[PDB]
Short mmCIF file of C-alpha atoms and ligand atoms in Angstrom, two decimals:
data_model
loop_
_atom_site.label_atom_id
_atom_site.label_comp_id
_atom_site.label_asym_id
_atom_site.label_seq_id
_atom_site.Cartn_x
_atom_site.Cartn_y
_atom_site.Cartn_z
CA UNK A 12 12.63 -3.74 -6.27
CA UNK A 13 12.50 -5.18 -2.70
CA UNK A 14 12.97 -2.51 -0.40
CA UNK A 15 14.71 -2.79 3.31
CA UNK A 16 12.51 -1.66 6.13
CA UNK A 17 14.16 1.64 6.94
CA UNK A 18 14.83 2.12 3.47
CA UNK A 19 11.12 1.68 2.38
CA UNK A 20 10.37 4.04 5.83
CA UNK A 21 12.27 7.22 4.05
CA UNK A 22 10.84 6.82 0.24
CA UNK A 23 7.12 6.70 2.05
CA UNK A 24 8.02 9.97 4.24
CA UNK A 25 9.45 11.59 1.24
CA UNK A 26 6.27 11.25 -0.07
CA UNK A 27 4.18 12.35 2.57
CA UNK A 28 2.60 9.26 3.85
CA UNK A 29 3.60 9.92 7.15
CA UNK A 30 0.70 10.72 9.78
CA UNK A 31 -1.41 10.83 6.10
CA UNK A 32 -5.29 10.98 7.48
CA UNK A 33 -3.18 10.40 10.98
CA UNK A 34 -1.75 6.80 10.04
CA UNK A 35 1.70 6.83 11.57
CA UNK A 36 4.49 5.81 9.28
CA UNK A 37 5.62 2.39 11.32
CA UNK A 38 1.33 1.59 10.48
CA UNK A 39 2.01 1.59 6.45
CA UNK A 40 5.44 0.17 6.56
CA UNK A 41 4.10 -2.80 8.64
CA UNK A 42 1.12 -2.75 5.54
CA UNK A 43 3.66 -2.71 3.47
CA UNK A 44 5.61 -5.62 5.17
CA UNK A 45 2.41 -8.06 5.29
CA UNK A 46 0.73 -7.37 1.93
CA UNK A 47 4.05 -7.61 -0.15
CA UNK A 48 7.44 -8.43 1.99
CA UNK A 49 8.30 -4.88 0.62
CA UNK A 50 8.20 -5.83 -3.01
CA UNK A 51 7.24 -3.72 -5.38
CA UNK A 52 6.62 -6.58 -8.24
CA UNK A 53 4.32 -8.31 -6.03
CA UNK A 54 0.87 -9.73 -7.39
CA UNK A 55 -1.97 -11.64 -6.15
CA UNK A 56 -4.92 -12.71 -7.97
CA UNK A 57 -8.27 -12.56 -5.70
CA UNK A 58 -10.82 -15.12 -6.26
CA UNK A 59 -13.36 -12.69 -8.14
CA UNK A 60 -10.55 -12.71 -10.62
CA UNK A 61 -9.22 -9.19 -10.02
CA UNK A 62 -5.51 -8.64 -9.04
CA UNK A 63 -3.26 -6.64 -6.33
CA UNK A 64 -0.37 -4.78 -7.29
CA UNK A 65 2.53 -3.41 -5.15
CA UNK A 66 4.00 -2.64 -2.44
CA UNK A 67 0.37 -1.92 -1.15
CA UNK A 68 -1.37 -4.65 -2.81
CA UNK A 69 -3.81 -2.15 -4.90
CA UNK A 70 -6.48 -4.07 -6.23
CA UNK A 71 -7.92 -3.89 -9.73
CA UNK A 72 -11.23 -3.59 -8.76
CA UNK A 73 -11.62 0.13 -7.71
CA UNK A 74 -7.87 1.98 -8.52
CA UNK A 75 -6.04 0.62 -11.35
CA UNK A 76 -6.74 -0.30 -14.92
CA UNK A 77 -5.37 -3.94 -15.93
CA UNK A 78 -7.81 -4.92 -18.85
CA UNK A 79 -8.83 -7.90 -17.00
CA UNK A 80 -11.08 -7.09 -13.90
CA UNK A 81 -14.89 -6.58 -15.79
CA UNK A 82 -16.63 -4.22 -14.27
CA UNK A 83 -13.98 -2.53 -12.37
CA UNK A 84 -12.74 1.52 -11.99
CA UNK A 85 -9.68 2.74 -12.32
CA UNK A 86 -10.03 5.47 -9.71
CA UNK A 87 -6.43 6.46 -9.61
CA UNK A 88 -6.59 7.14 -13.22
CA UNK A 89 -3.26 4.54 -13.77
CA UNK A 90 -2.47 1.43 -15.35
CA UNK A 91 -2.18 -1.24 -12.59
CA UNK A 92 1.81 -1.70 -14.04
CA UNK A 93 2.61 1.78 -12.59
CA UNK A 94 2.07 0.17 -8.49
CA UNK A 95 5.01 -2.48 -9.44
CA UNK A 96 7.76 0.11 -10.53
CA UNK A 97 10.80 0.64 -8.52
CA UNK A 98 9.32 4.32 -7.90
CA UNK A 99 7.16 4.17 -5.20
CA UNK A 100 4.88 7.69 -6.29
CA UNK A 101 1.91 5.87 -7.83
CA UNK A 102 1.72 3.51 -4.94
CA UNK A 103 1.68 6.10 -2.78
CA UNK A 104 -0.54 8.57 -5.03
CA UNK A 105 -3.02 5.63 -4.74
CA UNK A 106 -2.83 4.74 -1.38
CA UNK A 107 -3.60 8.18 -0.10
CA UNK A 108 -6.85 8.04 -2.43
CA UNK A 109 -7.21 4.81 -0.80
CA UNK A 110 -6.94 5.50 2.66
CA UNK A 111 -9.32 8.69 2.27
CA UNK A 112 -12.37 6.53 0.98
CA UNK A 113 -14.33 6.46 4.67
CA UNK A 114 -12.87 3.11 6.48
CA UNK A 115 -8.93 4.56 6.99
CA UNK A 116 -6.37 1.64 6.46
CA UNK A 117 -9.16 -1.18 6.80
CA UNK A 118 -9.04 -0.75 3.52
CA UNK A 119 -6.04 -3.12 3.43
CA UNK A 120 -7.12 -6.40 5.17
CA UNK A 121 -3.71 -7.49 6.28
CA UNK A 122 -3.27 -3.77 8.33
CA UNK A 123 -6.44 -4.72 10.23
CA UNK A 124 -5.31 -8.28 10.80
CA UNK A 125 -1.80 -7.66 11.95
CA UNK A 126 -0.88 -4.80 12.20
CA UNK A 127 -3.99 -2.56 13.58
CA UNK A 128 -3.16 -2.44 17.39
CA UNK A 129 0.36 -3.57 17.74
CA UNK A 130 3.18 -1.58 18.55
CA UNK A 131 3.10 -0.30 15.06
CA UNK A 132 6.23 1.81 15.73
CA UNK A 133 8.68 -1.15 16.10
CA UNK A 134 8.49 -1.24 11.98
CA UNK A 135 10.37 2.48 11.99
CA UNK A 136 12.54 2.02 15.29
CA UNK A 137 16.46 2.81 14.23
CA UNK A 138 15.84 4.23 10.93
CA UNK A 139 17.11 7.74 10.27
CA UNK A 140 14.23 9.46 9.23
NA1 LIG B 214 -9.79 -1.66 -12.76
#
């Protein structure tokens, strides 16, 4: 599913990502924007041959189980198909774990190269939230 911005704003709210560990909405829907143009079937392989999944770009390497990353966790306890549904929930589920693990959204390395700093609120203006 490929989401529109303000649509993508209200499933993320829903789920309580809003202000989660005091990231402002606008700051994971512009995440959301750079690591998958708000599709939730995007995938990227990373050079050390594990994979991101999502609308968050969850890697294999820590969070989800994909049978192909040696050596890797699966600390959200979920098969790495479950980030690329139309639901959002895992994603989210995961993310929060994510977010929570000491360095806040730097996790993600597109949120500190575009959107940490920037008028992050743009990315929710005119939605009806
Ligand atoms: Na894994």
């Amino acid at each position: 599913k490929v989401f529109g911005r303000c649509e993508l704003a209200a499933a993320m709210k829903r789920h309580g990502l809003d202000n989660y560990r005091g990231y402002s909405l606008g700051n994971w829907v512009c995440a959301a924007k750079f690591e998958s143009n708000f599709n939730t079937q995007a995938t990227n392989r990373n050079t050390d041959g594990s994979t991101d999944y999502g609308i968050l770009q969850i890697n294999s390497r820590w969070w989800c189980n994909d049978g192909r990353t040696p050596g890797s966790r699966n600390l959200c306890n979920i098969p790495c198909s479950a980030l690329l549904s139309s639901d959002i929930t895992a994603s989210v589920n995961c993310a929060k774990k994510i977010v929570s693990d000491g360095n806040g959204m730097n996790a993600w390395v597109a949120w500190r190269n575009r959107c940490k700093g920037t008028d992050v609120q743009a990315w929710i203006r005119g939605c009806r939230l």
